[PDB]
Design a protein around this nucleic acid. Structure first.
Ligand SMILES: [K+]
Ligand SMILES: [K+]
Ligand SMILES: [Mg+2]
Ligand SMILES: [Mg+2]
Ligand SMILES: [Mg+2]
Ligand SMILES: [Mg+2]
Ligand SMILES: [Mg+2]
Ligand SMILES: [Mg+2]
Ligand code: NA
Lengths: 204, 121, 38, 100, 144, 34
RNA sequence: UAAUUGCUAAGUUGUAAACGAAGUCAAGAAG
RNA sequence: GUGGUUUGGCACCUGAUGUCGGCUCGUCACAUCCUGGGGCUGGAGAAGGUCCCAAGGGUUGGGCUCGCCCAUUAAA
RNA sequence: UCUGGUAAGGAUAAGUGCUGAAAGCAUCUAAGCACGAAGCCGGCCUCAAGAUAAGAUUUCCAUAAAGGGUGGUUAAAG
């Protein structure tokens, strides 16, 4: 079970025992149930939650009808969560108090995008040779990519240059510092993937 | 941040003046040693009529680091030099005096006899 | 337990058994005669 | 060169019999294409996944290895129970022991 | 061995039904699963082959064990402290239904010989006898 | 020495034999297990 | 997916030895 | 008997199959260095020794050029 | 700077056993049954229906802004 969130930024606070704790602020916000999935119809149990208030200008007609059936105002982001203790119906509202009894949470996000990256940054390759001592033009080269005629191929899974970042990442077991229902705020110890303003999934 | 081939001042009244770090103890590929860490040293220079000989391999505990050290209360400390104190086989101070300040982290390193220090910071 | 290509009951008290396709020599009085791989 | 055979519905497929120790002793090997990527499985693993998977794996292998065989394997329907929905086709009951 | 008659005593009744043959007696009800090749109690081996003979002897011995279990039952005595109340895990040697136990020695009585042997083996597996010096769980050596 | 080994007999779910299940528990916590 | 009669239980098979145990089936000899 | 990893034998492929170490990047085997589980011990305990199962992950930096030495490490 | 790698859910290896014949004894095995490893299949993370066996659920359905495309202001996306 969990809720959708938005990353605000990082700060550092002082605990009760005088420890400087790095902290990520997350707006967890009121999530509305927009669909209940059941074993009989969908084949599995889950709840679909909507997070950020949208407008009819930015809601397509199919999604507008979906929200009309749910009898809620249109939402921008929808995500599914399973294993919800307690029954929830269509149009119910969940807030950051859902995490008021959790010591640790899981945060799923999309990491920052690096674009195309070479082997040195993407995979930590050591580079060919030294900066001097006869180096021509392979300071950031990969080196050899295989063996001789016996395999006569590059193996699948060989680490090469390519797109790095901008993908789904889960950070496990982040300690919860404080729940702030008056502002829908969640304070976690540590850092979470993505840039400020990205949408996060927070699982209990 | 002391590694192999780093030179340290010897901050006690034993004969050694300068020492060279041979190895940082504590695990495979352990790169750096900080305050309160135990290293192996080779003695590089001694005072005339010194108890310890030049070229003697010894153990030492790091007591001052130029690179800054972080404490859990959000504070940091850094020194102007890199200084160590020599130890015997039993793990005790080889000398009787300590010159200059030492880091407060040495209290918890089971190294309480460095309380000979003029000032613990 | 000793593994060899030729197992024999060197003593009357030794006994030969077959277990799951292998051959063992067992001796409860002295277990240092135990062998396998018949 | 023509798909000229029958459409076969097999019922009671979970009651098929394998002699000897072949239920767990017959080792099927496959490869994922990655280094160190050979994998093992058994007819028991197939049957646990479902009777149709084991039956398709066996019948393919006895079918011709071409486009016609790839199409022909799609005419085989395999069911664990006796409950299948193929009305309006009126399949006739064939005694399998009559064929030699 | 497998041909000797198996007399049923007084109070014990053995019923054969659907290869689930059960003997219900004074001290409990036990069950067994004979084969089609297998048939007081009088065994009958259909063939004289090796498999048939082995199965016949084994099944007759199992039936006799069942009869003894229902009629008289079985008991095993074994030789650090012990316990009397909690008969799941309450012995102290190092650190940290269908059977009856007594109050160091332990007497354990039951009607299923296989279960009694398994329980006794598990009880004795805590501390096997030590060749260096006589110590450990024993049923009621070498110099180092 | 408050910890203690706790092994309990229980019928098997796939065969039907009185198998054993073992776990470590506190000395006072053995009542909940058995 | 012929007919008849045996053997093998190792998937041996359907395309390496000295040396063990004799798993099984026959044919015997001494006692 | 097995292997082909040593020194060889043969001369079957080759109008070029072009070069020892080191670096980089690997991948596989198990004849197991460490970690995991066991049998025997001339195994009191603790250290070990030998054998069996087991290839998941790990498996240092230097002074010298297969090897020697210095300091480590669970192991090198 | 934060977080992670644990344990062993299931089946097993070498081994340890229960009951027990062939072979009135013995025997962990031939019928059955307990166990038992960083190894195997899972659990954890990411991808993943061109999985042509192309799956499921909710909603909407042709022309303006049912859906889109071209275009513009741009981006922690490239
Ligand atoms: K190739
Ligand atoms: K051939
Ligand atoms: Mg970017
Ligand atoms: Mg470089
Ligand atoms: Mg050059
Ligand atoms: Mg250059
Ligand atoms: Mg010639
Ligand atoms: Mg050419
Ligand atoms: Na073969």
């Amino acid at each position: 079970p969990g809720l959708l969130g938005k990353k605000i930024g990082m700060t550092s606070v002082f605990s009760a025992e005088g420890k400087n704790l790095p902290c990520t602020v997350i707006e967890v916000g009121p999530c509305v149930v927009t669909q209940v999935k059941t074993l009989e119809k969908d084949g599995y149990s889950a709840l679909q939650l909507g997070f950020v208030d949208a407008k009819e200008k930015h809601t397509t007609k199919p999604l507008a009808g979906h929200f009309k059936k749910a009898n809620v105002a249109p939402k921008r982001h929808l995500a599914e969560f399973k294993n919800f203790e307690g029954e929830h119906k269509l149009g119910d509202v969940l807030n950051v108090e859902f995490f008021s009894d959790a010591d640790f949470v899981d945060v799923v996000g999309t990491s920052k995008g690096k674009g195309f990256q070479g082997v040195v940054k993407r995979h930590g390759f050591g580079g060919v040779g030294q900066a001097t001592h006869g180096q021509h033009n392979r300071l950031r080269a990969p080196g050899a990519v295989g063996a001789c005629s016996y395999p006569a191929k590059v193996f699948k899974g060989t680490r090469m240059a390519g797109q790095m970042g901008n993908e789904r990442v889960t950070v496990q077991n982040l300690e919860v510092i404080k729940v702030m229902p008056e502002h829908n705020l969640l304070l976690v110890k540590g850092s979470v993937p993505g840039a400020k303003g990205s949408i996060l999934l927070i699982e209990k | 941040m002391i590694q192999q081939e780093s030179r340290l001042v010897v901050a006690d009244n034993s004969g050694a003046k300068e020492a060279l770090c041979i190895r940082v103890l504590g695990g495979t590929r352990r790169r750096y040693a900080s305050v309160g860490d135990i290293i192996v040293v080779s003695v590089k220079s001694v005072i005339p009529s010194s108890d310890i000989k030049k070229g003697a391999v010894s153990k030492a505990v790091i007591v001052r680091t130029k690179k800054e050290v972080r404490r859990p209360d959000g504070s940091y400390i850094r020194f102007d030099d890199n200084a160590c104190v020599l130890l015997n086989a039993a793990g005790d101070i080889r000398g009787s005096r300590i010159f200059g300040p030492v880091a407060r982290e040495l209290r918890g390193t089971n190294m309480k006899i460095v309380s000979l220090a003029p000032e613990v910071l | 337990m000793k593994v060899r290509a030729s197992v024999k009951k060197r003593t009357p008290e030794c006994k030969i058994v077959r277990r799951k396709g292998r051959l063992y020599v067992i001796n409860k009085k002295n277990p240092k005669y135990k062998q396998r791989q018949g | 060169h023509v798909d000229c055979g029958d459409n076969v519905i097999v019922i009671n497929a979970d009651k098929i019999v394998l002699s000897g120790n072949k239920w767990d002793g017959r080792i099927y090997l496959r490869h994922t294409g990655y280094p160190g990527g050979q994998r093992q499985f058994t007819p028991r693993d197939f049957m646990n996944k479902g009777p149709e998977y084991l039956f398709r794996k066996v019948v393919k292998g006895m079918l011709p290895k071409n486009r016609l065989g790839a199409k022909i394997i799609g005419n085989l329907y395999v069911y664990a129970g006796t409950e299948h929905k193929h009305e309006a086709q009126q399949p006739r009951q064939l005694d399998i022991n009559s064929l030699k | 061995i497998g041909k000797l008659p198996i007399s049923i005593p007084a109070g014990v009744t053995v019923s054969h039904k659907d290869e689930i043959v059960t003997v219900k007696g004074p001290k409990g009800e036990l069950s067994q699963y004979v084969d089609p090749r297998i048939t007081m109690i009088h065994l009958e081996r259909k063939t004289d082959d090796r498999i048939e003979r082995s199965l016949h002897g084994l099944y007759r011995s199992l039936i006799n064990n069942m009869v003894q279990g229902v009629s008289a039952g079985f008991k095993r005595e074994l030789e650090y402290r012990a316990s009397n109340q909690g008969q799941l895990l309450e012995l102290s040697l190092g650190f940290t239904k269908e059977v009856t136990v007594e109050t160091p020695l332990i007497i354990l009585e039951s009607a299923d010989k296989q279960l009694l042997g398994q329980v006794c083996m598990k009880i004795r597996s805590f501390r096997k006898p030590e060749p260096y010096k006589g110590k450990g769980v024993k049923f009621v050596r070498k110099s180092g | 020495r408050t910890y203690s080994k706790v092994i309990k007999m229980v019928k098997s779910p796939k065969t039907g034999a009185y198998t054993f299940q073992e776990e470590m528990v506190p000395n006072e916590a053995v009542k909940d297990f058995f």
